[PDB]
């Protein structure tokens with residue numbers, strides 16, 4: 001039932017993942033490059049190993065949560081002789097192409113492969129609300145899905161090994177988008193002596209409602225029909241000029257706004273002024 | 288539902304506003320540069336004037352809903368001889384500094400002034416929940432509220448005539464940040480084949496959760512303590528690179544992402560790495 005797992009990487013997230021597996025009843029074998037990181041985990045039942053090969057030999061599922069991909073692929077080489085017959089689960093973050101290169105390496109050593117992107121902070125691992133995106137052979141995922149649940153939620157995005165990274169990084173770009181907009185709003189609000197707490201209620205409500213617009217932008221993106229609904233790219237543009245002028249007269253930098261300006265203006269010059277926001281997506285694809 | 292109102296401007300939004308006032312019983316007089324947009328309006332009890340001045344002299348509250356502040360100010364200078372004793376409500380979009388100039392102009396000709404941001408589409412006007420932001424002298428608003436409710440939700444946001452524009456545009460900045468990050472994410476997801484209509488559920492849930500960090504960030508902006516929330520500007524600027532890299536791998540521009548990258552790097556160079564995102568706000572201040 002609770003299958004034996006290996007955790008390679010005893011950093012902040014490594015120790016939260018390993019703890020989560022012990023707290024779930026999985027016999028957890030850990031390993032770190034530097035010693036001294038497993039005292040509370042070993043006192044919970046975890047076994048610390050001295051060799052990375054030793055560790056990986058003690059699990060049918062090898063969770064890897066190292067620093068970058070550079071570290072990861074080095075370490076996994078040292079274990080390459082014993083890797084065959086286990087599933088790799090790289091919860092280390094990276095690019096989608098890196099995930100796709102490691103999938104080849106793994107499959108050339110007779111190891112299955114799953115990539116993951118943790119949408120959670122170490123402090124939430126094991127507890128509700130944690131999300132870890134996963135990508136890889138659907139086969140491999142179904143088998144590990146329950147093991148992986150010890151971390152939180154397991155959401156599979158497809159057999160593209162880079163699918164976890166891609167949704168991880170895209171969800172970051174969205175997050176940074178909203179926050180970027182919000183901090184500029186706050187900067188404008190603060191420039192005029194207006195307290196920030198107090199505006200955020202109104203912001204959340206506004207943004208919550210705006211989120212209901214996305215299913216229609218989704219449609220037009222996938223459809224091709226970039227038809228408007230009451231505010232076409234050309235109108236939205238004129239509105240952005242006031243936003244740039246309000247920021248320039250209150251003493252706030254337009255730096256976060258200037259890309260959005262150019263993408264709107266470029267859709268006007270492209271022929272989408274009477275179209276909807278969905279037509280701005282392939283405008284970001286220079287390929 | 289009984290103060291006499293004048294609508295200068297019979298575009299799409301203009302015709303909404305006036306029909307909402309007629310639908311409330313308000314005695315309403317309408318004017319548009321181009322004649323022939325009054326049919327339904329007059330048939331509902333309204334009255335169309337020929338000169339803006341005639342129209343302004345038949346109403347106490349003068350709702351202005353024209354094309355830009357230039358058009359507005361041109362039109363209002365025509366009616367300045369007859370603007371004394373009246374209350375201007377400029378529902379035409381604009382900047383904070385523009386409202387404050389219109390205020391002083393009206394006081395100088397004997398008129399009261401509220402500025403207005405319509406956070407609604409013309410079809411929502413009159414319907415409950417259509418949001419319009421007003422700012423100006425407070426007792427002017429309190430006397431107008433029952434008229435202003437014809438259009439829907441009237442909110443007063445300060446004696447500063449510039450306040451409604453500052454809140455309209457600041458919520459616009461916020462909404463364009465989120466759309467920006469959604470569009471950049473969809474670009475990325477679409478470059479790999481992922482249909483966006485299936486991605487939108489995961490985006491909405493993800494961004495809805497990320498809205499929870501705002502009330503913390505706001506306290507930081509207001510307090511001065513940009514204490515980390517765990518994730519720090521210095522680590523939020525170490526996965527901005529995998530995002531940048533994945534964006535390139537999929538043929539997607541980094542245009543909407545370079546300003547956040549730079550701001551995050553500026554904060555590190557300012558000693559705010561261990562601080563949280565709330566520090567970025569006072570770095571958005573034009574030096």
Ligand SMILES: NC(=O)C1=CN([C@@H]2O[C@H](COP(=O)(O)OP(=O)(O)OC[C@H]3O[C@@H](n4cnc5c(N)ncnc54)[C@H](OP(=O)(O)O)[C@@H]3O)[C@@H](O)[C@H]2O)C=CC1
Pocket residue numbers: 009010011012013014032033034037065066067068071075091092093094118119120121122526
């Ligand atoms: N921390 C977080 O909140 C989040 C992190 N992640 C991702 O998780 C991964 C790990 O982050 P985190 O746990 O905080 O990392 P840490 O900074 O805590 O440490 C990284 C891990 O890599 C090990 N390591 C570093 N260099 C080497 C090396 N040359 N050879 C072998 N092992 C090495 C470290 O052991 P040593 O003691 O020897 O350095 C440590 O176990 C990253 O890819 C990160 O993006 C996921 C989401 C958020």
Ligand SMILES: NC(=O)C1=CN([C@@H]2O[C@H](COP(=O)(O)OP(=O)(O)OC[C@H]3O[C@@H](n4cnc5c(N)ncnc54)[C@H](OP(=O)(O)O)[C@@H]3O)[C@@H](O)[C@H]2O)C=CC1
Pocket residue numbers: 230296297298299300301302319320321352353354355358362378379380381404405406407408409
């Ligand atoms: N529509 C919307 O969804 C939103 C609109 N608003 C605000 O409402 C305003 C009106 O929008 P909407 O009704 O859709 O715009 P329209 O383009 O439908 O109408 C614009 C108005 O401006 C008038 N106008 C244009 N040029 C002149 C001029 N030189 N002299 C006099 N009048 C002139 C037009 O009169 P004419 O018929 O003769 O051209 C018309 O009444 C916007 O500019 C904005 O400030 C608020 C938020 C969103």
